[PDB]
Symmetry: D2
Subunit: 310 residues, 4 copies
């Protein structure tokens, strides 16, 4: 049995010149996860500050950009830190009031501004391919923490009886094929033609290709992503009438999940280009997102190409 | 603060003739919920056997009919008992492997055969309107037990720090209106024409009626039902290519949930008639199911009328 | 597996004319125990009010006399209740600050004043032989609840994973012989001559009678009593320079523990007479106490008789 | 709030030459504490094997010497490790069966044999003054981990709701004076004359010096030591009829506790000389032990001088 704490240190030791700064940051994030886990499991019987405070009170990160807050947060006294964190403290917030799965998403980048000075939006506007690490914590029937630093997707399950995250899989990967699609069809009307065509494709009868597919949409990016990673599948959030540029935030949701998806052998695009290669323009920039099994994402890209929108 | 154990006893004393037999049954079911909660929260660091072995451990039921892995099992209990139980120990079982919400469903009936004799199938084939009690346990981000005996939908939240279920609401009810629909569109192709038309209706742009609706489908009857009860909405599982007569079992899923829905001010039908009044023919009978806010279920019934199937 | 909750009800059913009032009281006490357990297991990370409030808020007892409080507590609106409770919410209080075992003691009596009127000190000054029930909860490495109603000593172990007390032994009894004595020798100087002589006896070398005995003194009546009940032994608190009449309170500590000791096949006396037959004179009356294995208590009585004090 | 995991890392960085090897050892011991805490809190609803299997699971120690059920076992670890560990996985083991306080003791030494070779007994026979670290875990009403590496006695409380040890005090110290003595008077007969005289001293009536003292003896070295450190006091285990050279093992109990006692401003001797300076002769060596407030241990040494044994 190996704990997340032991695992992080073991990976650090593969880098003889590591100083322990990244290890300290990942360790602080897992502590934040335990705190959130505790509060969630006792609703009726915050998250944003919990992670910020937990991280700030530890002089471990130069700054943080939180999905809610319109502006970054510069940690005083941590100007000498080299990493910045972008986070979605509570993904699928809505589900909290109904006892359904929710999650936390995090993305880590090495700052571009000089260490010793205050971070700027420039440190938070780097393309996804610059991520040092990314991960999520899914709080459901049980809790799991999943992350990557570029050498695979490490999955851990929280053991309440011990109060620690235990290694589940050192290199989690999407299964060979997927047969589940996750999308909110309530916004069907203005879905791009390609997405409507893809959904049709998903509903056709064809045993040879595991069709018709089954649909699942929890309402939490993290939870749906997690299920698709474990059993195979695809998550889709295209442009809609309410969100012409897509709903998900490129920097707080798309980039982190795309990094994880790729490291698990999957794919993540906006329907036409690789999510991780998009050069961000603003902190709250939104983007269409299709992520999951490679063959499924490729199908979506095919239909979008073949059935353009006027 | 009031515990479920205390609540059950208080209710018993509202009946001068009560002997405590039903109380012992409701109490055993609550304990079973705790056992399942434990096993589930320990994914890796079933409910069916534990429940049966428990419900027999005290000879508190005349017999039990259960749905286990698409298989229906009947168990013989104490011939001197007057209540019979139908259950779904694990609803949405496949969700267990992905740390997603799952639940338990139970339904109680007073036997029709004379006490002191062995129970027959007739004791389990009564129409839903004869239920003495119905309820579910939802194991998600947190756990809740919801049940009814005819005087409202009582909702309780589990307090892990004390190991007790705490009263949340004595009479839970659907909000005035709903704006969420839950269905597996993967089986779209052979949905009845009315259901396809209803989905279209749900997607039209019309603010005055909260449209387009939002879509959510966790994959667990209990979890989706639970969410729609708390926030309003409708769950649908019509006839499909794979299940010509619907997928849900009339006895272990439809009747119990219908009892709860009506008690909460909602409606439950198979598309044309009231679920609770259907006279069952077999222990494995399946049925189309539409349940949730009344105006939503009425819409489905209407569209099915305006657009019949050949 | 049987829970304390199930057990209490099963015993109630042996009395066809029981109304459930005693069951409700015992049930409320166990809930109070869970509450105390929770707070104790998180020191740094009350008890009196917890039990009073928990019991009062349930209109379950006519009144309560707490070891601390100099006067009884009449529960308003519960004048119609027939039972009164004497308690030691936190026994061995001192040990709480040092992470050592502590406990809760309770004693139940049927009131003597008419139901419907306020209880008086007379209802709390009855001799121990009138107890309807008595028990304790020991909070240590793990927690256990132990009680009796006159038909043996029922022992339960708290299962944190389930949040319930599980039956350990339906009739716990002292082992055939004991070889542990528990006393605070710091107060040796004014110990009665018989007690000094008994201690000498305990220290003699004589394998045939398991001597010399081993000594153990946790500082918590409940914890020491509990260990002696499980492994055999005797607890002693005689008159001392600081407490000429003994330290323990006759009504809140001696009577409850004597009832339990006798029901477990042991003995409890003040050195000359049966504790349960002493007719109390005041609410905070103190008394010498020797309790545990019968042969050991008899030895103490023998030495006290044979070596009187001037 | 600071966790033990964070505290250990902070301490490591106070040493420019640190490589993280000792940190990995202290971290493994802390995890082992959590494992034992779990098993213990689950009495019925061992520490030795779990600890060894764990401390080997990562090849983090050159070797381990342990006391298990009065038996001494030696285990061979990674030849490339430079630290050796001596432990008492379960101290006061018999207390487990009675839900009483128990503990774990550990002692760490830098090996004397060259790294890269197999460890010898010489690596485990060093005098206490060569310890790199010492500490204990007390599992009682609640759990605490206390340790030292030479810069104070660091005390931590376990938070079950988060599964982490939280810093309570960086430099725990005995209060100015003590007024509690802990010893098993059951073995009185052959106590040395000085110890008998000291006990007399403890029982004299003299307010000016807080006498008579109070007596407490839980039966667990760790628990009694823990209490005396927090409230002041002295623990004594001299030579007895059953153990002519004392009962406590010099290596697994005396040295570790002596290290902690001195670091807290206390004293630890065998009655005549400093425990930490004794040169061990065997792995099973036992020794008389007097530890706690300095003035108390000095009194014992004095009485032993004024009243020698033939
Ligand atoms: N715990 C770790 N897991 C994975 N990679 C790590 C870890 N610690 C350090 N590294 C790698 O080494 C680099 C330098 O680490 P640091 O000195 O802590 O900033 C990081 O940017 C990573 O590329
Ligand atoms: N705990 C309870 N909650 C709700 N209704 C109850 C309860 N106990 C008894 N009843 C009602 O009283 C009837 C007779 O109770 P019993 O004698 O336990 O079968 C039941 O069929 C219910 O209608
Ligand atoms: N749960 C129980 N366990 C043991 N004896 C009980 C229980 N409930 C009732 N009794 C006995 O029946 C008497 C009347 O019960 P009650 O009507 O609840 O006051 C009590 O005083 C006891 O002698
Ligand atoms: N976590 C720590 N806590 C206390 N002292 C430490 C720690 N890590 C290293 N040291 C000290 O630094 C020395 C060398 O560390 P290491 O290279 O890990 O063996 C140890 O022998 C200790 O004296
Ligand atoms: O309600 P919709 O439009 O289906 O959007 C749901 C999506 O929005 C999100 O909730 C956005 O994240 P937040 O909950 O943090 O705002 C995703 O987790 C989820 O996939
Ligand atoms: O996978 P599908 O066809 O959408 O079916 C989902 C439905 O099937 C069920 O799982 C049937 O219950 P079981 O999990 O007990 O088989 C419902 O809980 C759920 O609503
Ligand atoms: O400190 P002393 O004199 O040994 O007395 C200890 C005794 O006093 C008591 O603590 C009295 O109970 P309280 O702790 O509730 O006052 C007993 O539990 C214990 O046996
Ligand atoms: O039963 P006795 O002779 O008083 O011995 C008690 C002492 O023995 C010990 O239990 C020895 O440790 P172990 O429990 O590991 O054998 C100490 O913890 C305790 O202080
Ligand atoms: O193809 P049509 O008739 O426009 O119907 C659109 C429907 O297409 C289906 O594929 C979608 O699952 C529905 O959500 C949608 O309403
Ligand atoms: O018998 P003496 O010499 O008066 O000694 C009294 C001693 O007698 C022993 O039996 C007690 O355990 C001691 O606590 C006490 O001090
Ligand atoms: Cl850690
Ligand atoms: Cl961890
Ligand atoms: Cl409950
Ligand atoms: Cl209960
Ligand atoms: Cl219980
Ligand atoms: Cl920790
Ligand atoms: Mg969010
Ligand atoms: Mg989000
Ligand atoms: Mg099922
Ligand atoms: Mg089901
Ligand atoms: Mg008290
Ligand atoms: Mg007391
Ligand atoms: Mg031991
Ligand atoms: Mg020991």
């Amino acid at each position: 049995m190996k704990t997340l704490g032991e695992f992080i240190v073991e990976k650090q030791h593969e880098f003889s010149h590591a100083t322990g700064e990244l290890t300290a940051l990942l360790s602080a994030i897992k502590l934040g996860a335990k705190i959130i886990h505790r509060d969630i499991n006792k609703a009726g019987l915050f998250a944003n500050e919990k992670l910020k405070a937990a991280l700030k009170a530890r002089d471990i990160v130069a700054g943080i950009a939180s999905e809610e807050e319109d502006e970054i947060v510069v940690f005083e006294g941590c100007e000498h830190a080299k990493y910045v964190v972008l986070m979605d403290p509570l993904d699928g917030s809505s589900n909290i009031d109904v006892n359904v799965s929710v999650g936390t998403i995090f993305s880590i980048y090495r700052r571009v501004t000089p260490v010793g000075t205050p971070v700027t939006e420039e440190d938070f506007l780097q393309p996804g391919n610059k991520q040092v690490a990314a991960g999520y914590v899914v709080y459901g029937s049980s809790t799991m923490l999943v992350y990557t630093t570029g050498c695979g997707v490490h999955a851990f399950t929280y053991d309440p009886s011990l109060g620690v995250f235990c290694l589940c899989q050192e290199r989690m990967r999407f299964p060979e094929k997927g047969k589940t699609y996750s999308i909110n069809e309530g916004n069907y009307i203005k879905f791009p033609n390609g997405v409507k065509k893809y959904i049709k494709f998903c509903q056709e009868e064809d045993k040879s290709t595991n069709r018709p597919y089954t649909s699942r949409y929890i309402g939490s990016l993290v939870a749906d992503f997690h299920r698709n990673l474990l059993k195979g599948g695809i998550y889709l959030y295209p442009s809609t009438a309410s969100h012409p540029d897509g709903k998900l935030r490129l920097l707080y949701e798309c980039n982190p999940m795309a990094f994880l998806a790729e490291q698990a052998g999957g794919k993540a695009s906006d329907g036409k280009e690789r999510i991780l290669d998009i050069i961000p323009e603003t902190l709250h920039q939104r983007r269409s997102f299709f992520v999951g099994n490679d063959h499924m994402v490729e199908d979506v890209e095919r239909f979008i190409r073949e059935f353009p929108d006027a």
